[PDB]
Amino acid sequence: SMNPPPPETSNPNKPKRQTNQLQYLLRVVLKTLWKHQFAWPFQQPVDAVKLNLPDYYKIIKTPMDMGTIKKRLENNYYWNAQECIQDFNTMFTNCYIYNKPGDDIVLMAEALEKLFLQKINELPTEE
Numbered sequence: 001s002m003n004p005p006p007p008e009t010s011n012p013n014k015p016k017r018q019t020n021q022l023q024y025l026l027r028v029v030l031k032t033l034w035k036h037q038f039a040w041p042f043q044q045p046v047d048a049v050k051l052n053l054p055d056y057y058k059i060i061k062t063p064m065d066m067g068t069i070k071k072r073l074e075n076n077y078y079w080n081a082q083e084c085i086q087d088f089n090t091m092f093t094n095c096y097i098y099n100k101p102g103d104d105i106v107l108m109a110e111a112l113e114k115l116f117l118q119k120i121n122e123l124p125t126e127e
């Protein structure tokens with residue numbers, strides 16, 4: 001079968017912005033997660049074809065991954081921090097929805113989410 005197009009990382013019709021919170025999300029949160037031992041399966045869109053997961057995009061209709069988030073941050077795609085936090089949450093929830101609770105990928109996601117929550121706990125006040 002085929003993969004869907006990936007989520008957009010830029011859009012001329014979407015207002016763009018940089019805030020200190022978004023700067024923190026790229027510099028501190030994304031960077032910390034990106035270098036984690038278990039980050040790699042989350043660093044790009046799920047390739048359902050090459051991973052032989054024909055039902056993935058039948059079940060997951062709002063895909064998200066850290067590669068997309070990284071690019072969105074780099075492109076000033078977001079208007080605010082909440083949009084970016086929502087993308088992280090979508091990434092984690094998708095993983096928990098599609099996979100079985102005791103699967104390795106779920107434990108990998110759980111480790112990353114714990115670290116994510118630790119880092120966004122110190123999200124600075126907006127300036």
Ligand SMILES: Cc1noc(C)c1-c1ccc2c(Nc3ccccc3C(C)(C)C)c(C(=O)O)cnc2c1
Pocket residue numbers: 040041042046047051053094095098099104105
């Ligand atoms: C993230 C994510 N969310 O749902 C799924 C499904 C994934 C996912 C899972 C595995 C990936 C993967 N490797 C792979 C393939 C089959 C079984 C087990 C794995 C492990 C646990 C080793 C990662 C790769 C890869 O092998 O490159 C890429 N993306 C994946 C996404």
